[PDB]
Amino acid sequence: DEAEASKFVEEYDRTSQVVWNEYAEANWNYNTNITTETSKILLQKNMQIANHTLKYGTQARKFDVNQLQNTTIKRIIKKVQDLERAALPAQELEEYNKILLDMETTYSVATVCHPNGSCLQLEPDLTNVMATSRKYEDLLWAWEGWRDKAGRAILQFYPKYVELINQAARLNGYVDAGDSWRSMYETPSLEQDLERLFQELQPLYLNLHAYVRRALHRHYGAQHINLEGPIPAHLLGNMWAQTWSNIYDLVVPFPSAPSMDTTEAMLKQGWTPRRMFKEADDFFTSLGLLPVPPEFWNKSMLEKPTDGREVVCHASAWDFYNGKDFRIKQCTTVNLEDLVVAHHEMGHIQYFMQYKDLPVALREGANPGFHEAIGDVLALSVSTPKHLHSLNLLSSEGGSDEHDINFLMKMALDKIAFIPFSYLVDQWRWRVFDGSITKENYNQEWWSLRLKYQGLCPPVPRTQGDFDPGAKFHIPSSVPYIRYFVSFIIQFQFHEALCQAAGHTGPLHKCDIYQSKEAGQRLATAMKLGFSRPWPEAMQLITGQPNMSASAMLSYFKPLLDWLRTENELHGEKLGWPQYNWTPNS
Numbered sequence: 001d002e003a004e005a006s007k008f009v010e011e012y013d014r015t016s017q018v019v020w021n022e023y024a025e026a027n028w029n030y031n032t033n034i035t036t037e038t039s040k041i042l043l044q045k046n047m048q049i050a051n052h053t054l055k056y057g058t059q060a061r062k063f064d065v066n067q068l069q070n071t072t073i074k075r076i077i078k079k080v081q082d083l084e085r086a087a088l089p090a091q092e093l094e095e096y097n098k099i100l101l102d103m104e105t106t107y108s109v110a111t112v113c114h115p116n117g118s119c120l121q122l123e124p125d126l127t128n129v130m131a132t133s134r135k136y137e138d139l140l141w142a143w144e145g146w147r148d149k150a151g152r153a154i155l156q157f158y159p160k161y162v163e164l165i166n167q168a169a170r171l172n173g174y175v176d177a178g179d180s181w182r183s184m185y186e187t188p189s190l191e192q193d194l195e196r197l198f199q200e201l202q203p204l205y206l207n208l209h210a211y212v213r214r215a216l217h218r219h220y221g222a223q224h225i226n227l228e229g230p231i232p233a234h235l236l237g238n239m240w241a242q243t244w245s246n247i248y249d250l251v252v253p254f255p256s257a258p259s260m261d262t263t264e265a266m267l268k269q270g271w272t273p274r275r276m277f278k279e280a281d282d283f284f285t286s287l288g289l290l291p292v293p294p295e296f297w298n299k300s301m302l303e304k305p306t307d308g309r310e311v312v313c314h315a316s317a318w319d320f321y322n323g324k325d326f327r328i329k330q331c332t333t334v335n336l337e338d339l340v341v342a343h344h345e346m347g348h349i350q351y352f353m354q355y356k357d358l359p360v361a362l363r364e365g366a367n368p369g370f371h372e373a374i375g376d377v378l379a380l381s382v383s384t385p386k387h388l389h390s391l392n393l394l395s396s397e398g399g400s401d402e403h404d405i406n407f408l409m410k411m412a413l414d415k416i417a418f419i420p421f422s423y424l425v426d427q428w429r430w431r432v433f434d435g436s437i438t439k440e441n442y443n444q445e446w447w448s449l450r451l452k453y454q455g456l457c458p459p460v461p462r463t464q465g466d467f468d469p470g471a472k473f474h475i476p477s478s479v480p481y482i483r484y485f486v487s488f489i490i491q492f493q494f495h496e497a498l499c500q501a502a503g504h505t506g507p508l509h510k511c512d513i514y515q516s517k518e519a520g521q522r523l524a525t526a527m528k529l530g531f532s533r534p535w536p537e538a539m540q541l542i543t544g545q546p547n548m549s550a551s552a553m554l555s556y557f558k559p560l561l562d563w564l565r566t567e568n569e570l571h572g573e574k575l576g577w578p579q580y581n582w583t584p585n586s
């Protein structure tokens with residue numbers, strides 16, 4: 001009955017706090033200090049948490065969920081019935097945990113070396129090469145080398161990973177791991193909804209793609225860019241060509257309206273990783289949102305250790321299920337890109353702090369996209385020329401329609417280009433998980449989607465043994481990706497809603513919500529719900545309506561769409577890549 005059910009969830013919450021806190025501690029210790037010992041302690045703590053998950057999950061399944069009145073209780077129990085990997089038999093669970101460890105370790109310690117020269121790590125060395133080199137061959141060296149070293153090394157693990165994650169999913173009542181991941185949205189129409197949103201961003205993406213392609217043609221040469229074909233994947237300023245704003249210098253709409261070198265500005269003005277996170281902290285509190293506790297400053301890892309010791313650099317935000325202990329682990333570089341990343345990560349921290357008083361079972365985003373969006377929303381305001389000038393990182397850019405188009409381009413290179421990338425990652429993984437793509441076809445099907453959605457081609461033909469997906473963090477780390485597609489759509493809906501609540505008029509892209517208590521209150525009420533209600537309720541609290549919608553993002557970028565159509569038309573661009581079979585000749 002009802003009494004036994006609420007007693008069970010009370011017990012689950014107390015015991016889970018302790019066990020998850022211990023697990024998080026050991027996971028943190030490994031991530032911030034990769035050694036045999038920390039690896040050993042982590043794999044053992046995996047047994048402890050799996051023990052706990054099994055005890056409570058087993059009990060939870062004995063409840064017939066739909067004989068239960070209270071919906072919150074009903075919700076916690078159905079959630080605890082999913083054992084995740086702890087559903088696996090002992091032998092397989094051991095193997096699965098080791099596979100995950102080996103994949104994440106392989107990715108985070110991989111280096112690319114010059115023969116009898118220096119070896120480069122992904123962060124910051126290879127990231128910098130991809131961002132700043134303008135030499136075709138040097139970009140290719142980094143692009144291919146990273147795949148050769150990280151991607152190829154992951155392949156040995158992946159088929160067994162897929163087998164075991166699917167097995168766990170079936171043991172929890174799903175048909176495969178991709179089914180399990182999609183269920184996080186509790187939205188039957190999810191796939192159709194995402195396809196519709198993607199299609200809505202097509203006019204903008206194709207126009208951006210055509211314009212950038214033309215600019216690359218100008219720089220890298222006619223013999224290396226097909227004006228009617230896909231773009232070589234190593235030329236977009238980013239290892240995965242997922243965000244393109246590092247090639248802003250190659251594509252600036254009005255070079256007569258230069259922008260201040262923001263990296264130079266931050267360096268000269270003595271900016272440090274600590275200052276970057278303090279600025280993000282200030283933006284959150286300016287909205288009437290929560291400051292990070294003193295403990296955050298004590299315990300976080302805000303730059304790469306110089307100890308020589310090895311870490312997982314890929315940025316992350318950590319809840320220790322204390323209601324007290326929250327940490328970021330980021331190998332912060334002093335530049336504008338990492339200032340934005342800091343805001344992204346501080347977004348997750350804010351969410352942790354807002355829902356800290358809920359049962360741990362409900363300590364999640366309304367959906368995973370909500371958790372990813374919070375930090376990015378504030379970052380949209382931080383990124384405005386007006387705000388950056390206030391931080392002394394840009395000079396006065398206001399008024400000028402030239403600076404205005406330039407700013408919109410700078411934003412589109414990231415926000416619009418990322419749409420097809422974020423969409424395709426889990427299109428690939430869902431089909432791996434459902435058995436549509438086998439290990440024979442992993443890489444070929446990845447490039448088929450790279451072509452279909454982003455209109456990119458690999459600069460060097462792929463060969464047997466390549467596994468380019470393994471060269472992207474989220475693949476060996478088994479972190480779902482569709483959350484980021486959702487985030488990019490909804491963060492603009494949030495921006496639009498918060499801006500109108502803040503009383504801002506005129507073009508959406510001119511909005512800066514700094515210090516708006518009205519905007520802060522909307523975000524806080526939504527975040528406080530955690531995972532306690534269907535996500536459309538949190539959507540409603542922020543935006544006044546319950547749907548995901550591209551209209552806000554389209555509205556933000558409307559002036560750029562008009563500019564790009566006019567520009568592309570006057571140059572006679574053919575939108576898309578009708579010569580889709582094109583690959584580099586040399």
Ligand SMILES: O=C(N[C@@H](Cc1ccccc1)P(=O)(O)C[C@@H](Cc1cc(-c2ccccc2)no1)C(=O)N[C@@H](Cc1ccc(O)cc1)C(=O)O)OCc1ccccc1
Pocket residue numbers: 243314315316317318319337340341344345348364365371372376414418477479484
């Ligand atoms: O810490 C995370 N998640 C991190 C990933 C993760 C998850 C589990 C275990 C380990 C790690 P991230 O997404 O913050 C880590 C962030 C890092 C990051 C990079 C950049 C970036 C933007 C522009 C140019 C260059 C870089 N922006 O954010 C991430 O991966 N982002 C995706 C997607 C992305 C997001 C925002 C964005 O602007 C661009 C891309 C990526 O790097 O591919 O989740 C915390 C949490 C959430 C919900 C519940 C519990 C805990």
Ligand SMILES: *[C@@H]1O[C@H](CO[C@@H]2O[C@@H](C)[C@@H](O)[C@@H](O)[C@@H]2O)[C@@H](O[C@@H]2O[C@H](CO)[C@@H](O)[C@H](O)[C@H]2NC(C)=O)[C@H](O)[C@H]1NC(C)=O
Pocket residue numbers: 006007009010070071072073358359532
């Ligand atoms: C359904 O139950 C929720 C949860 O109740 C809490 O957790 C249970 C395990 C048990 O320990 C209860 O005594 C707890 O109150 C109720 O939501 C709570 O309601 C109170 C009072 O309004 C509120 O202050 C709390 O914040 C709520 N907690 C959560 C986690 O939402 C809810 O009222 C019940 N619904 C109905 C219709 O009775």
Ligand SMILES: *[C@@H]1O[C@H](CO)[C@@H](O)[C@H](O)[C@H]1NC(C)=O
Pocket residue numbers: 033035036037038307309
């Ligand atoms: C790294 O881990 C080892 C155990 O493997 C530990 O003794 C050492 O103190 C750790 N280093 C740091 C800097 O925490």
Ligand SMILES: [Cl-]
Pocket residue numbers: 240468469
């Ligand atoms: Cl790739």
Ligand SMILES: [Cl-]
Pocket residue numbers: 181184368369480481482483484
């Ligand atoms: Cl997700």
Ligand SMILES: [Zn+2]
Pocket residue numbers: 344345348371372
């Ligand atoms: Zn994130």
